[PDB]
Design an enzyme around this catalytic site. Structure first.
Site: not given
Ligand SMILES: Cc1cc2nc3c(=O)[nH]c(=O)nc-3n(C[C@H](O)[C@H](O)[C@H](O)COP(=O)(O)OP(=O)(O)OC[C@H]3O[C@@H](n4cnc5c(N)ncnc54)[C@H](O)[C@@H]3O)c2cc1C
Length: 383
Positions: A32, A95, A173, A297, A310
């Site tokens: 990651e 999320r 957002r 994605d 998702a």
């Protein structure tokens, strides 16, 4: 004889792929780029086609955790820029809560997980594949790339000609804790809502819509403002803007007195600024020697109106794990190709549905795991 899998990108897709490959007896090393779990995100939804994968983890305890962390919405109230207009099997969840739940479970299985690992280089031979991380080569039998819509892996595996395309709409957002709002008199309409239950509000203007909801039984607030912007320069999920931008958009709205405090109390006065993007169908998700595959994605971004991002990330991760298990160490190339062929048309059909809505049971009722077990040998023969 154990299959060694590298996974790049620990979002929903990569975490599902990590958990499922580990459950299928593969040895996972996952990477990651962020230095730690960031806890960022908007509400997305998890449908029954994803829930069938999840409920098998730890006797449903992960499903239970997700259910506890959801937005427990009774109704959606739809208002216009001045007043009320309308009141109305998957569940809505922030999320950040979902990936945190997924990650804590994944790491508890003993999976080798490495943060601060920005991967751009992919390689493969007839017998192995891998990546470069921090200057050093990491090798395995195959590589699953789930690095998201701005995938560097897609550049390496498929080419850089196909790129995510703007739609003309952009979103401001944010989400924050309810305690940041309580006490503001302009927000009692939202904070003094029925307890133990979350609310969702749509405010519909001319080419502007504002969403306002609560999550986790009133512990969380979130809001979003979708508008038409052809020249927005956002290039990532963490691009920020001052919340002034969204307040300006609704400056002549009658309901502005209700909405402005929600945006203004956003911590640090910063919101995320995102494009709404689509992407052409890729010719292939799979590397020339069939040991590397992009999923999630990175391979098939969906317009947000499908609510499938998702879900299909989770279906992807479950499918590839089964395909590797059924193919075995000696036929990893076959398993990778079978996983592509199992999924390619279904995700493409979902993407096209999104464009059709932009101007169904076949999605929600599908069981991707039983499908993969049923169809593997048929599809392996075609490959
Ligand atoms: C921080 C963040 C915020 C998001 N916000 C929204 C939102 O508001 N609305 C929405 O609809 N969708 C949002 N998404 C995307 C959403 O999660 C997906 O549409 C879907 O739910 C899951 O797709 P995915 O798992 O394939 O990819 P993602 O969830 O995007 O995860 C990809 C992961 O790969 C990591 N990564 C990227 N590049 C590299 C690299 N070079 N090396 C290593 N790791 C890498 C990223 O840090 C991320 O953890 C967001 C994703 C992220 C990461």
């Amino acid at each position: 004889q154990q299959i060694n899998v590298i996974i790049v990108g620990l979002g929903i897709a990569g975490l599902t792929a990590a958990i499922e490959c580990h459950r299928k007896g593969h040895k996972v090393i996952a990477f990651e780029k962020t230095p730690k779990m960031m806890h960022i995100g908007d509400i997305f939804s998890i449908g029954p086609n994803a829930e069938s994968v999840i409920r098998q983890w730890k006797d449903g305890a992960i499903s239970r955790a997700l259910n506890e962390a959801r937005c427990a919405i009774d109704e959606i109230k739809v208002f216009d820029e001045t007043g009320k207009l309308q009141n109305v099997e998957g569940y809505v969840i922030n999320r950040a809560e979902a990936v945190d739940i997924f990650f804590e479970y994944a790491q508890s299985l003993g999976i080798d997980i490495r943060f601060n690992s920005n991967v751009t280089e992919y390689w493969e031979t007839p017998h192995n594949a891998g990546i470069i991380v921090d200057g050093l080569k990491i090798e395995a039998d195959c590589v699953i790339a789930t690095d998201g819509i701005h995938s560097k892996a897609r550049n390496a595996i498929c080419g850089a000609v196909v790129q995510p395309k703007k739609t003309g709409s952009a979103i401001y957002r944010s989400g924050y804790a309810m305690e940041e709002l309580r006490g503001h008199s302009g927000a009692v309409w939202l904070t003094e809502g029925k307890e133990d239950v979350d609310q969702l509000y749509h405010f519909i203007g001319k080419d502007i819509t504002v969403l306002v909801g609560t999550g986790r039984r009133g512990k969380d607030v979130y809001w979003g403002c979708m508008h038409k912007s052809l020249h927005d320069v956002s290039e990532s999920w963490i691009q920020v803007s001052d919340v002034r931008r969204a307040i300006e958009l609704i400056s002549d709205w009658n309901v502005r007195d209700r909405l402005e405090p929600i945006m203004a109390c956003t911590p640090q006065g910063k919101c995320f600024d995102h494009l709404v993007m689509t992407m052409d169908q890729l010719p292939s998700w799979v590397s020339p020697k069939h040991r590397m595959i992009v999923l999630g994605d990175a391979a098939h971004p969906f317009l947000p109106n499908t609510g499938q991002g998702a879900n299909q990330a989770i279906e992807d991760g479950a499918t590839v794990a089964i395909c590797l298990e059924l193919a075995g160490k000696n036929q990893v190339t076959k398993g990778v190709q079978v996983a592509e062929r199992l999924r390619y048309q279904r995700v493409a059909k979902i993407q096209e549905l999104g464009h059709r809505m932009l101007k169904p049971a076949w999605i929600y009722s599908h069981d991707c795991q039983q499908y993969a077990y049923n169809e593997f040998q048929t599809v392996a023969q075609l490959v």
